[PDB]
Amino acid sequence: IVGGYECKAYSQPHQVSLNSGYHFCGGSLVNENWVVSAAHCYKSRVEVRLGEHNIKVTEGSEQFISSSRVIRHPNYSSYNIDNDIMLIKLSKPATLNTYVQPVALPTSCAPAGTMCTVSGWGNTMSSTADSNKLQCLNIPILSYSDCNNSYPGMITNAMFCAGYLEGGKDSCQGDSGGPVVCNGELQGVVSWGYGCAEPGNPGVYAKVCIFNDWLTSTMASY
Ligand SMILES: [Ca+2]
């Protein structure tokens, strides 16, 4: 996260770290058994680390839970990063507590101008902001017209842009798969962009609201 601030106590309890020997992607807990992340973060098995603030320190709030299933959206396409969403089933339920709490999946799409929060442990492009301490940033949803203008022909129904076309504030490398929360619910998944925080190159996010039926029916196959 570039241009953000260290997240406050208690504040992003749905944020998870995906780990394969190291942090490589974020994700969001959406109920006791399931995490939503980005399909480009797929690995056949992952350790989900919940209750984290500093990913390098054992704080006593963490839960480490292996995946039992990792399910990419069936229409994920790497050439264009389309349908960049994935479900991870936890091999045992997460324990919900002060530090670990799910975020709801919205059935309605947030309009242009809505202020949201993105978070993660990715690059900060800052000499004093520590990427190991979870970072938070407020970003507004951009219009479709500005999103497509930034990346002509590259924006699909499954994407939205959010951030600042002036540059300086964005998600980055290592934030992928993590949450964009708007009015308390998971509107986006960190997906792609050209560079990080560059003028004219806003962040692109998977548009969670149009995947509700895939998400809920996949999770219901207990
Ligand atoms: Ca920790």
Swiss-Prot record:
The record marks D170 as: Required for specificity. One of its GO terms (cellular component) is extracellular space. Keywords: Calcium, Digestion, Disulfide bond, Hydrolase, Metal-binding, Protease, Secreted, Serine protease, Signal, Zymogen. GO terms for biological process: digestion; proteolysis. Its EC number is 3.4.21.4. Pfam families: Trypsin. Its cofactor is Ca(2+). One of its GO terms (molecular function) is metal ion binding. Belongs to the peptidase S1 family. This is Trypsin-1. It comes from Salmo salar.
